[PDB]
Design a protein around this ligand. Structure first.
Ligand SMILES: *[C@@H]1O[C@H](CO)[C@@H](O[C@@H]2O[C@H](CO)[C@@H](O)[C@H](O)[C@H]2NC(C)=O)[C@H](O)[C@H]1NC(C)=O
Ligand SMILES: *[C@@H]1O[C@H](CO)[C@@H](O)[C@H](O)[C@H]1NC(C)=O
Ligand SMILES: *[C@@H]1O[C@H](CO)[C@@H](O)[C@H](O)[C@H]1NC(C)=O
Ligand SMILES: *[C@@H]1O[C@H](CO)[C@@H](O)[C@H](O)[C@H]1NC(C)=O
Ligand SMILES: *[C@@H]1O[C@H](CO)[C@@H](O)[C@H](O)[C@H]1NC(C)=O
Lengths: 105, 90, 242
């Protein structure tokens, strides 16, 4: 589990397109076990690959027809770890749509 | 790359194993990852999350519930796989 | 493998970016997993998953216009272990008879939804320990007399985490063996009826973090081993029989 370079897709609804941006996120392996003895008072813990610290950066997004350029703010991992996904800021699923997902094309 | 993290598999539990009759356990490493939530996703959710995480966990695909020594009932795992995590949140 | 709108992969079906308002009838009867993602489904009809004696998981995720779950959608599903309803923005109604006898239900997840009421689980009668994990449903404000009765014949974990719960009624957990209870982040909840745990195996672990609760009922907490509030407790208190 380490910081990796990925390509995320940023999409402009009005313009019916996405632009691709290279950034840095988390991916890799983390250790987990599955208990064989259950103490209802000592439940299990699992860890996932995810950010420990992140920053925001902005990017200019092309316009079209009747819509001028815009700005978009996005998250950038600065440090990963095997931890708990922070459900305040994170959507903890099995599968998302993927970084470079686009409604068009 | 392959820095080291052993693959999810069956192993013997040192604390409940006995010579001639071991009990096995799923432990190891699964793949997971975090990345910016697709704008499209944010539309399916009443509560906005700028980051999305997908994760899988090392768990028992099939098991047997046997009893050992001190009158503890335990699970004897027969198959492992990386599957859904239920205890990794917040 | 393919069908126009859905991929019959290897016993694992995915309806993504759908050409459907209803779940297709012509889905192969021997599926282990059905995933409906980014769909245009408005309703999940009655007996939708009727005839799948091999179904193990149903993922309903990121469905923008899913609004209604009919009666008897989850029934006659002997192998079903996991139901995951995630991210249905406009799902405001689940029919009080949606779930019915799933001897094998281990996991039931409902999150980031618009439902205003907790599911009716009293007909499930699952033979295994169930993890009931209902979260981020900002419109659920109340738990009522007998909400989790009949869910399972054993230890049940209830994560009623992060909704808009403001009121819990007495005997909410009546007839239930409360393994764990999480009522964290329901930050308008400030009282527990002195009869909440009436007729229950009482929480072993109890999570009241980020609520306005400032006291617990006198009985029902006889098995409390852990209390999560502002910090966690165990041998930091011997009166963990409050
Ligand atoms: C408390 O829990 C029990 C179930 O464990 C509720 O059910 C009573 O007992 C049997 C089933 O064990 C039912 O057939 C009856 O319908 C129930 N009796 C009554 C008086 O309702 C019981 O209802 C719950 N108690 C409360 C306060 O509603
Ligand atoms: C990501 O790509 C940049 C070059 O565009 C590179 O400098 C950097 O080392 C890469 N990130 C990592 C952590 O390998
Ligand atoms: C980011 O770098 C990768 C290869 O390192 C490449 O596929 C891609 O073209 C780069 N993105 C941009 C915006 O040029
Ligand atoms: C646990 O199962 C394995 C086979 O999967 C077997 O070799 C072992 O003897 C079993 N142990 C017990 C305690 O029955
Ligand atoms: C998440 O992103 C939105 C823009 O999409 C931004 O305005 C907001 O400040 C971000 N939230 C957090 C927790 O930083």
């Amino acid at each position: 589990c380490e910081l990796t370079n990925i390509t995320i897709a940023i999409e402009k609804e009005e313009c019916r397109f996405c632009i691709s941006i290279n950034t840095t996120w988390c991916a890799g392996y983390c250790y987990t076990r599955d208990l064989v003895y259950k103490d209802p008072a000592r439940p299990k813990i699992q860890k996932t690959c995810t950010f420990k610290e992140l920053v925001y950066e902005t990017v200019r997004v092309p316009g079209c027809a009747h819509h001028a350029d815009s700005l978009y703010t996005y998250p950038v991992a600065t440090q990963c770890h095997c931890g708990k996904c922070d459900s305040d800021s994170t959507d903890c699923t099995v599968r998302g749509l993927g970084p470079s997902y686009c409604s068009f094309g | 790359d392959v820095q080291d993290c052993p693959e999810c598999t069956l192993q013997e539990n040192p604390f409940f194993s006995q010579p001639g009759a071991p009990i096995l356990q799923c432990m190891g490493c699964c793949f997971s990852r975090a990345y910016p939530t697709p704008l499209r996703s944010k539309k399916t959710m009443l509560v906005q999350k700028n980051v999305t995480s997908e994760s899988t966990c090392c768990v028992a695909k099939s098991y047997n519930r046997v009893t050992v020594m001190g009158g503890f009932k335990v699970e004897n795992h027969t198959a492992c796989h990386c599957s859904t995590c239920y205890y990794h949140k917040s | 493998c393919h069908h126009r709108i859905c991929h019959c992969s290897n016993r694992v079906f995915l309806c993504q970016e759908s050409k459907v308002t209803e779940i297709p009838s012509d889905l192969p009867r021997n599926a282990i997993e059905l995933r409906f993602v980014l769909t245009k489904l408005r309703v999940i009809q009655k007996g939708a998953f009727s005839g799948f004696g091999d179904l193990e998981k149903i993922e309903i995720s990121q469905n923008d216009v899913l609004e209604v779950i009919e009666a008897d959608v989850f029934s006659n599903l002997p192998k079903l272990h996991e139901i995951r309803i995630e991210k249905a923005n406009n799902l405001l109604y689940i029919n009080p008879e949606a779930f019915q006898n799933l001897p094998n239900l281990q996991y039931l997840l409902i999150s980031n939804t618009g439902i205003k009421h907790l599911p009716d689980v009293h007909k499930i009668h699952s033979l295994q320990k169930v993890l009931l994990d209902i979260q981020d449903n900002i419109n659920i404000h109340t738990i009522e007399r007998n909400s989790f009765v009949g869910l399972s014949f054993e230890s049940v974990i209830l994560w009623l985490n992060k909704n808009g719960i403001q009121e819990i009624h007495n005997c909410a957990f009546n007839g239930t063996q409360l393994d764990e209870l999480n009522l964290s982040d329901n930050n308008n909840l400030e009282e527990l009826p002195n009869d909440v745990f009436h007729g229950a195996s009482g929480p072993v672990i109890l999570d009241i973090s980020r609520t306005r609760i400032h006291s617990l009922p006198s009985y029902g907490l006889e098995n409390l081993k852990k209390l999560r509030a502002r910090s966690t407790y165990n041998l930091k208190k011997l009166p963990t029989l409050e």
